[PDB]
Amino acid sequence: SGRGKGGKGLGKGGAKLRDNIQGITKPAIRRLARRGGVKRISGLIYEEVRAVLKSFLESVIRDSVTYTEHAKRKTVTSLDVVYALKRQGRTLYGF
Amino acid sequence: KETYSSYIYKVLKQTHPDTGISQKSMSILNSFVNDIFERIATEASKLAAYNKKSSAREIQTAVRLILPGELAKHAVSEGTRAVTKYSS
Amino acid sequence: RTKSNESRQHLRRPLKRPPLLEQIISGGLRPKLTTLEKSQLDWASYVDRAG
């Protein structure tokens, strides 16, 4: 029993991608364009729309996170977005 | 918590006795009423700070430049009729 | 309180529970085998015997 070696000692216990990429797609932008009333479009719009998201979403995101930090809430609620929308000049009803 | 669903419900009922409501629309109306109240009330506060001093004239004038005049005259007239009804 | 002691039991202990045979085989499938450790035993025995 004592002499020799073998695996019968269970173990001691050791330890044993977060980059993320932007989404959206061309058909979604095409549907949004068709909602806006455009007959024909060129092939250079999608990059610019993606730029509009990359310039619009992140700013309100920063304002929202600094607001909820100013509220001393370690979580984000839908009501926090409404403050950002109000100070951005485009308010949303329903939340 | 005191909701405002009852008042808007009875106003809809006295203006439309067979038209229903949707839950999303209830929040829509609640937010509309709340933010209009706050907007006109801070307008009244800034109109009180307008005069070099510490009523109803301030609120009448505040509603008199915040919303289009066509509905503004009706608003002030019906408010005055309401206060006359409440006076005695 | 002045009784005739307690002579009726004669040290009864029928099973309940076997020390190691119950844990290893009672009955089949190594009760609560959770095959990972049964595989541990098998692999250790195989590697030891095969050198």
Closest-CA distance, C41 to chain A, in angstroms, reads 7
Whether A4 maps to a domain, the answer reads no
* Count of helices and strands (H, E) across chain C: 2, 0
The identity of residue A40, as a single letter, is R
Q: What value does the CA radius of gyration of chain A take, rounded to a whole number of Å?
A: 25
Beta carbons of A94 and B28 less than 8 Å apart: yes
Considering the domain boundaries, does residue A81 fall inside one?
yes
Domain that holds residue B25: 1-88
> Looking up tokens 């951005």, which residue turns up?
A88
Q: Running DSSP on this structure, what letter comes out for residue A77?
A: -
Helices (H), chain A: 26-35, 45-70, 78-87
Nearest CA in chain B to A79: B31
Distances in Å between the alpha carbon of C41 and those of A4, A59, A70, C35, C48?
15, 59, 58, 10, 11
Domain assignment of residue A12, yes or no: no
- Please report the DSSP string for C22-37 in residue order: HHH-SSSSTTT-TTHH
Domain that holds residue A26: 17-95
- The CATH number of residue B9's host domain is 1.10.20.10
Partners of residue B34 in chain A, C-beta under 8 Å: none
Query: B: neighbours with 3+ CB pairs under 8 Å?
Result: A
Q: Which of B32, B53, B4 is nearest to A91 (CA)?
A: B32
- DSSP secondary-structure letter at B51? S
**Tokens, residue B58:** 């301030």
CATH label of the domain that carries residue A94: 1.10.20.10
Q: Where are the alpha helices (DSSP H) in B51-68?
A: 57-66
Domain count for chain B: 1
Count of domains for chain A: 1
Residues 6-45 of C with CB under 8 A from A: 40, 43-44
Experimental method: cryo-EM
Instruction: Tell whether A91 lies on the interface with B, counting CB pairs under 8 A.
Output: yes
Which residues touch C51 (CB under 8 Å, ≥6 apart)?
A: none
The number of angstroms, rounded, from the C-alpha of A48 to the middle of its chain's C-alpha atoms is: 19
DSSP SS3 for A37:
coil
For A16-34, give one letter per residue: b (16+ CB within 10 A) or e: eeeeeeeeeeeeebeeebe
Maximum alpha-carbon separation in chain C: 69
Phi, psi values for residue B56, rounded to 5°: -105, -20
Within 8 A of A1 by CB-CB distance, chain C residues are none
Find where tokens 């009672």 sit: C26
Tell whether A56 lies on the interface with B, counting CB pairs under 8 A. no
> Residue B22 to residues B10, B19, B32, B47: CA-CA distances in angstroms?
15, 10, 15, 37
Distance from CA of C15 to the nearest CA of A (A): 26
Distance between CA atoms of residues B46 and A87, nearest Å: 19
Give the minimum alpha-carbon distance from A62 to chain C in angstroms, rounded to a whole number: 49
Q: Please tell me the distance in Å from B40's CA to the nearest CA on chain A.
A: 15
What the block records as the tokens of A94 is: 């329903």
Amino acid identity, residue A10? L
Measured distance CA(A7)–CA(C45) in Å, rounded: 9
> Is A8 domain-assigned?
no
Q: List the resolution, Å.
A: 3.5
